[PDB]
PDB file of C-alpha atoms in Angstrom:
ATOM      1  CA  UNK F 976      78.259 150.177 110.799  1.00 59.18           C
ATOM      2  CA  UNK F 977      79.219 147.459 113.286  1.00 55.58           C
ATOM      3  CA  UNK F 978      77.382 144.902 111.131  1.00 56.96           C
ATOM      4  CA  UNK F 979      79.428 145.724 108.021  1.00 58.14           C
ATOM      5  CA  UNK F 980      82.553 145.164 110.152  1.00 61.56           C
ATOM      6  CA  UNK F 981      81.492 141.619 111.056  1.00 62.92           C
ATOM      7  CA  UNK F 982      81.105 140.754 107.357  1.00 61.95           C
ATOM      8  CA  UNK F 983      84.576 142.183 106.682  1.00 59.15           C
ATOM      9  CA  UNK F 984      86.150 140.230 109.537  1.00 60.18           C
ATOM     10  CA  UNK F 985      84.661 136.930 108.390  1.00 58.91           C
ATOM     11  CA  UNK F 986      85.806 137.644 104.846  1.00 58.42           C
ATOM     12  CA  UNK F 987      89.313 138.318 106.224  1.00 60.64           C
ATOM     13  CA  UNK F 988      89.259 134.968 108.079  1.00 60.64           C
ATOM     14  CA  UNK F 989      87.963 133.094 105.016  1.00 62.00           C
ATOM     15  CA  UNK F 990      90.582 134.802 102.805  1.00 65.06           C
ATOM     16  CA  UNK F 991      93.342 133.743 105.209  1.00 61.33           C
ATOM     17  CA  UNK F 992      91.973 130.225 105.464  1.00 62.33           C
ATOM     18  CA  UNK F 993      91.590 129.689 101.714  1.00 60.51           C
ATOM     19  CA  UNK F 994      94.908 131.232 100.746  1.00 61.79           C
ATOM     20  CA  UNK F 995      96.965 129.414 103.335  1.00 59.45           C
ATOM     21  CA  UNK F 996      95.298 126.117 102.481  1.00 63.58           C
ATOM     22  CA  UNK F 997      96.228 126.683  98.820  1.00 64.01           C
ATOM     23  CA  UNK F 998      99.793 127.613  99.729  1.00 64.48           C
ATOM     24  CA  UNK F 999     100.201 124.802 102.288  1.00 61.77           C
ATOM     25  CA  UNK F1000      99.290 122.127  99.723  1.00 61.87           C
ATOM     26  CA  UNK F1001     101.934 123.499  97.335  1.00 65.19           C
ATOM     27  CA  UNK F1002     104.501 124.273 100.068  1.00 63.24           C
ATOM     28  CA  UNK F1003     104.574 127.963  99.184  1.00 68.14           C
ATOM     29  CA  UNK F1004     106.040 129.927 102.088  1.00 69.08           C
ATOM     30  CA  UNK F1005     103.911 132.756 103.414  1.00 68.88           C
ATOM     31  CA  UNK F1006     103.896 135.345 106.181  1.00 69.23           C
ATOM     32  CA  UNK F1007     100.714 137.312 106.899  1.00 69.52           C
ATOM     33  CA  UNK F1008     100.482 139.730 109.813  1.00 71.73           C
ATOM     34  CA  UNK F1009      97.128 141.267 110.817  1.00 73.49           C
ATOM     35  CA  UNK F1010      97.423 144.509 112.762  1.00 77.98           C
ATOM     36  CA  UNK F1011      95.143 145.027 115.720  1.00 78.82           C
ATOM     37  CA  UNK F1012      95.275 147.662 118.486  1.00 77.88           C
ATOM     38  CA  UNK F1013      99.076 148.107 118.201  1.00 74.94           C
ATOM     39  CA  UNK F1014      99.900 150.068 115.061  1.00 74.55           C
ATOM     40  CA  UNK F1015     102.224 148.462 112.517  1.00 74.82           C
ATOM     41  CA  UNK F1016     102.664 151.510 110.292  1.00 76.58           C
ATOM     42  CA  UNK F1017     106.408 151.451 110.908  1.00 72.88           C
ATOM     43  CA  UNK F1018     106.614 147.999 109.275  1.00 72.97           C
ATOM     44  CA  UNK F1019     104.060 148.715 106.539  1.00 74.57           C
ATOM     45  CA  UNK F1020     106.480 151.462 105.454  1.00 77.63           C
ATOM     46  CA  UNK F1021     109.185 148.864 104.736  1.00 75.36           C
ATOM     47  CA  UNK F1022     107.029 147.026 102.185  1.00 76.15           C
ATOM     48  CA  UNK F1023     105.581 147.680  98.757  1.00 74.79           C
ATOM     49  CA  UNK F1024     102.286 149.566  99.227  1.00 72.32           C
ATOM     50  CA  UNK F1025      99.189 147.812  97.854  1.00 74.99           C
ATOM     51  CA  UNK F1026      96.278 149.311  99.828  1.00 73.10           C
ATOM     52  CA  UNK F1027      94.209 146.557  98.223  1.00 76.73           C
ATOM     53  CA  UNK F1028      90.931 144.811  98.896  1.00 77.04           C
ATOM     54  CA  UNK F1029      91.440 141.576 100.831  1.00 78.40           C
ATOM     55  CA  UNK F1030      90.935 138.403  98.850  1.00 77.69           C
ATOM     56  CA  UNK F1031      92.261 134.849  98.957  1.00 76.13           C
ATOM     57  CA  UNK F1032      93.286 135.234  95.302  1.00 75.46           C
ATOM     58  CA  UNK F1033      95.423 138.316  95.885  1.00 75.74           C
ATOM     59  CA  UNK F1034      97.060 136.755  98.927  1.00 78.77           C
ATOM     60  CA  UNK F1035      97.979 133.694  96.838  1.00 78.35           C
ATOM     61  CA  UNK F1036      99.360 135.752  93.952  1.00 80.08           C
ATOM     62  CA  UNK F1037     101.510 137.829  96.345  1.00 80.89           C
ATOM     63  CA  UNK F1038     103.432 134.836  97.709  1.00 81.57           C
ATOM     64  CA  UNK F1039     104.241 133.048  94.426  1.00 81.92           C
ATOM     65  CA  UNK F1040     108.002 132.388  94.692  1.00 84.10           C
ATOM     66  CA  UNK F1041     110.547 134.543  92.855  1.00 85.04           C
ATOM     67  CA  UNK F1042     108.027 137.306  92.109  1.00 86.73           C
ATOM     68  CA  UNK F1043     108.296 141.030  92.906  1.00 89.51           C
ATOM     69  CA  UNK F1044     105.965 140.870  95.955  1.00 90.65           C
ATOM     70  CA  UNK F1045     106.823 137.603  97.710  1.00 86.82           C
ATOM     71  CA  UNK F1046     110.004 138.392  99.608  1.00 84.06           C
ATOM     72  CA  UNK F1047     108.678 139.296 103.033  1.00 85.20           C
ATOM     73  CA  UNK F1048     105.434 139.747 104.936  1.00 85.18           C
ATOM     74  CA  UNK F1049     101.975 140.846 103.941  1.00 88.45           C
ATOM     75  CA  UNK F1050     100.560 143.275 106.507  1.00 89.11           C
ATOM     76  CA  UNK F1051      96.772 143.647 106.759  1.00 89.86           C
ATOM     77  CA  UNK F1052      95.449 146.839 108.308  1.00 89.79           C
ATOM     78  CA  UNK F1053      91.767 147.403 108.797  1.00 90.46           C
ATOM     79  CA  UNK F1054      90.064 146.119 105.699  1.00 91.30           C
ATOM     80  CA  UNK F1055      93.054 146.315 103.350  1.00 93.42           C
ATOM     81  CA  UNK F1056      96.157 144.463 102.362  1.00 91.76           C
ATOM     82  CA  UNK F1057      98.401 147.405 103.275  1.00 89.74           C
ATOM     83  CA  UNK F1058     101.772 146.200 102.014  1.00 91.37           C
ATOM     84  CA  UNK F1059     103.622 143.169 100.710  1.00 89.64           C
ATOM     85  CA  UNK F1060     107.292 142.221 100.976  1.00 89.54           C
ATOM     86  CA  UNK F1061     107.452 143.973 104.355  1.00 90.39           C
ATOM     87  CA  UNK F1062     110.035 143.513 107.079  1.00 92.11           C
ATOM     88  CA  UNK F1063     109.143 142.060 110.476  1.00 92.30           C
ATOM     89  CA  UNK F1064     111.617 142.093 113.380  1.00 95.39           C
ATOM     90  CA  UNK F1065     113.255 138.767 114.184  1.00 97.76           C
ATOM     91  CA  UNK F1066     112.795 137.365 117.674  1.00 97.47           C
ATOM     92  CA  UNK F1067     115.997 136.765 119.620  1.00 96.99           C
ATOM     93  CA  UNK F1068     114.314 133.862 121.462  1.00 95.23           C
ATOM     94  CA  UNK F1069     116.487 130.734 121.818  1.00 93.51           C
ATOM     95  CA  UNK F1070     113.292 128.828 122.623  1.00 93.09           C
ATOM     96  CA  UNK F1071     112.182 128.841 118.987  1.00 94.71           C
ATOM     97  CA  UNK F1072     113.018 125.478 117.440  1.00 98.14           C
ATOM     98  CA  UNK F1073     116.024 125.410 115.161  1.00 98.33           C
ATOM     99  CA  UNK F1074     113.877 123.428 112.702  1.00 99.21           C
ATOM    100  CA  UNK F1075     111.819 126.553 111.997  1.00103.33           C
ATOM    101  CA  UNK F1076     112.856 129.194 109.496  1.00102.38           C
ATOM    102  CA  UNK F1077     113.092 132.958 109.172  1.00103.37           C
ATOM    103  CA  UNK F1078     109.356 133.337 108.551  1.00104.40           C
ATOM    104  CA  UNK F1079     108.660 131.810 111.952  1.00102.16           C
ATOM    105  CA  UNK F1080     111.306 133.922 113.716  1.00100.23           C
ATOM    106  CA  UNK F1081     109.869 137.078 112.140  1.00100.89           C
ATOM    107  CA  UNK F1082     106.337 136.120 113.065  1.00100.33           C
ATOM    108  CA  UNK F1083     107.496 135.494 116.616  1.00 99.66           C
ATOM    109  CA  UNK F1084     109.422 138.778 116.637  1.00 99.66           C
ATOM    110  CA  UNK F1085     106.477 140.974 115.676  1.00 97.14           C
ATOM    111  CA  UNK F1086     104.237 139.095 118.118  1.00 96.71           C
ATOM    112  CA  UNK F1087     106.566 140.099 120.959  1.00 99.87           C
ATOM    113  CA  UNK F1088     106.203 143.863 120.345  1.00 98.94           C
ATOM    114  CA  UNK F1089     102.613 144.177 119.030  1.00 99.88           C
ATOM    115  CA  UNK F1090      99.218 142.589 119.533  1.00100.10           C
ATOM    116  CA  UNK F1091      99.115 141.485 115.904  1.00100.98           C
ATOM    117  CA  UNK F1092      98.048 138.012 114.773  1.00102.15           C
ATOM    118  CA  UNK F1093     100.588 136.491 112.403  1.00100.97           C
ATOM    119  CA  UNK F1094     100.133 133.399 110.241  1.00102.74           C
ATOM    120  CA  UNK F1095     103.021 131.442 108.715  1.00102.52           C
ATOM    121  CA  UNK F1096     103.007 128.818 105.979  1.00103.72           C
ATOM    122  CA  UNK F1097     106.194 126.761 106.060  1.00104.84           C
ATOM    123  CA  UNK F1098     107.801 126.230 102.675  1.00104.95           C
ATOM    124  CA  UNK F1099     109.565 123.175 104.132  1.00105.44           C
ATOM    125  CA  UNK F1100     106.563 121.252 105.499  1.00109.60           C
ATOM    126  CA  UNK F1101     103.419 123.097 104.443  1.00110.23           C
ATOM    127  CA  UNK F1102     102.530 123.340 108.115  1.00110.24           C
ATOM    128  CA  UNK F1103     100.587 126.407 109.161  1.00110.28           C
ATOM    129  CA  UNK F1104     101.624 128.237 112.331  1.00110.09           C
ATOM    130  CA  UNK F1105     100.383 131.285 114.205  1.00105.63           C
ATOM    131  CA  UNK F1106     102.040 133.784 116.557  1.00104.73           C
ATOM    132  CA  UNK F1107     100.379 135.987 119.178  1.00102.84           C
ATOM    133  CA  UNK F1108     101.810 137.814 122.213  1.00102.58           C
ATOM    134  CA  UNK F1109     105.170 136.096 122.043  1.00101.37           C
ATOM    135  CA  UNK F1110     103.739 132.569 121.694  1.00101.00           C
ATOM    136  CA  UNK F1111     103.852 130.123 118.800  1.00 99.62           C
ATOM    137  CA  UNK F1112     101.030 127.809 117.796  1.00101.58           C
ATOM    138  CA  UNK F1113     102.938 125.326 115.643  1.00 99.69           C
ATOM    139  CA  UNK F1114     101.452 123.225 112.797  1.00 98.80           C
ATOM    140  CA  UNK F1115      97.794 123.906 113.600  1.00 98.45           C
ATOM    141  CA  UNK F1116      94.921 121.960 112.064  1.00 97.84           C
ATOM    142  CA  UNK F1117      92.343 123.650 109.869  1.00 96.85           C
ATOM    143  CA  UNK F1118      89.890 123.433 112.756  1.00 98.69           C
ATOM    144  CA  UNK F1119      92.398 124.983 115.168  1.00 97.59           C
ATOM    145  CA  UNK F1120      93.311 127.773 112.771  1.00 96.15           C
ATOM    146  CA  UNK F1121      89.624 128.555 112.308  1.00 95.37           C
ATOM    147  CA  UNK F1122      88.856 128.753 116.044  1.00 91.32           C
ATOM    148  CA  UNK F1123      91.853 130.977 116.744  1.00 90.50           C
ATOM    149  CA  UNK F1124      91.138 133.323 113.834  1.00 90.76           C
ATOM    150  CA  UNK F1125      87.501 133.502 114.934  1.00 94.70           C
ATOM    151  CA  UNK F1126      88.431 134.303 118.519  1.00 95.95           C
ATOM    152  CA  UNK F1127      91.147 136.803 117.660  1.00 96.91           C
ATOM    153  CA  UNK F1128      89.844 138.573 114.520  1.00101.10           C
ATOM    154  CA  UNK F1129      86.073 138.777 115.053  1.00100.35           C
ATOM    155  CA  UNK F1130      85.387 141.583 117.520  1.00101.85           C
TER     156      UNK F1130
END
């Protein structure tokens, strides 16, 4: 019961790590929000429902540019990719650097009103960023991404 969950959470982390590394190298923009205690059903409803098993391959295929599923956020809920091409609210923060794009503003926006963990791949730089509780972790290393995902997603 609780042991099966740990396997699922590590698979989720690995799937995020592999897919964002693939997308970062190719400068494919991506926006992946993982729901936690705060429901995100209201934003899942804005996307295209997938209700799919989590995998690095499916995450990569979702974000391929100019495809039906890429234009918005993936939302992960429990052990599923719930929706793709979903809306996330844009932060009104003037503290967010003007160098960062809409993906970053939307990740910051959802992090201000939920406890989700949101991962961004920049299509401009390939840098990977994370938002949590209204804060931005900009351009994190693979080691840093791993430690944060471990701390925040393995419970």
